[PDB]
Amino acid sequence: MNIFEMLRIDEGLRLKIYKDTEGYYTIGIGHLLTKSPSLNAAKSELDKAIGRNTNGVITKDEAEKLFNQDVDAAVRGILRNAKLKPVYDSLDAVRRAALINMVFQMGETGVAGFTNSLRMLQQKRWDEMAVNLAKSRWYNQTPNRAKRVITTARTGTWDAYK
Ligand SMILES: [Cl-]
Ligand SMILES: [Cl-]
């Protein structure tokens, strides 16, 4: 198990524009297109993203390309962020993957905002951190995905994904 396999499970794979769980236009493997209620605006973003006139449909290869770019952006976002970086550095390879998963899903600014859990994280207060992350919109909105990431963070094992 690695960060790629982890997110592939969490996000799934769709070759056609779709709406995330919050109503947003998405494609491939969890790649947000726009937060705009316009399908045309989504087909626009997609073509700009892909380099061509997709008529809203991409190939597996094209989805993997976006995915590669998105994991890379998540990792660089973490390392460049003053709040995220030290948490990251302080952790083990498994727990690190869980942070990257949260950043990919919620953006660097969003995760950076979890002040209290980042501190519990850094201090290794595992159980308490799991209880706190559960108290969130994120968990309430996507509970099954949240439980797996939170468990990964909590235990440092890939159990939830096996
Ligand atoms: Cl992009
Ligand atoms: Cl879910």
UniProtKB/Swiss-Prot annotation:
GO terms for molecular function: lysozyme activity. One of its GO terms (cellular component) is host cell cytoplasm. InterPro entries: Endolysin_T4_type (IPR034690), Glyco_hydro_24 (IPR002196), Lysozyme-like_dom_sf (IPR023346), Lysozyme_dom_sf (IPR023347), Phage_lysozyme-like (IPR052619), T4-type_lysozyme (IPR001165). It is found in: Host cytoplasm. Changing N132 to M/F: 2-fold decrease in enzymatic activity. It is an enzyme of class 3 (hydrolase). It comes from the Viruses. Pfam families: Phage_lysozyme. SUPFAM superfamilies: Lysozyme-like. One of its GO terms (biological process) is peptidoglycan catabolic process. Its EC number is 3.2.1.17. Changing E11Q: Complete loss of activity. Changing G30A: Almost complete loss of enzymatic activity. Induction: Expressed late in the viral replication. Changing T26E: Complete loss of activity at neutral pH; covalently bound substrate. Its main location: host cell. Changing D20C: Nearly no effet on specific enzymatic activity. Changing D20 to E/Q: Loss of 99% of enzymatic activity. Keywords: Antimicrobial, Bacteriolytic enzyme, Cytolysis, Glycosidase, Host cell lysis by virus, Host cytoplasm, Hydrolase, Viral release from host cell. Endolysin with lysozyme activity that degrades host peptidoglycans and participates with the holin and spanin proteins in the sequential events which lead to the programmed host cell lysis releasing the mature viral particles. Once the holin has permeabilized the host cell membrane, the endolysin can reach the periplasm and break down the peptidoglycan layer. Belongs to the glycosyl hydrolase 24 family. This is Endolysin. It comes from Enterobacteria phage T4 (Bacteriophage T4).
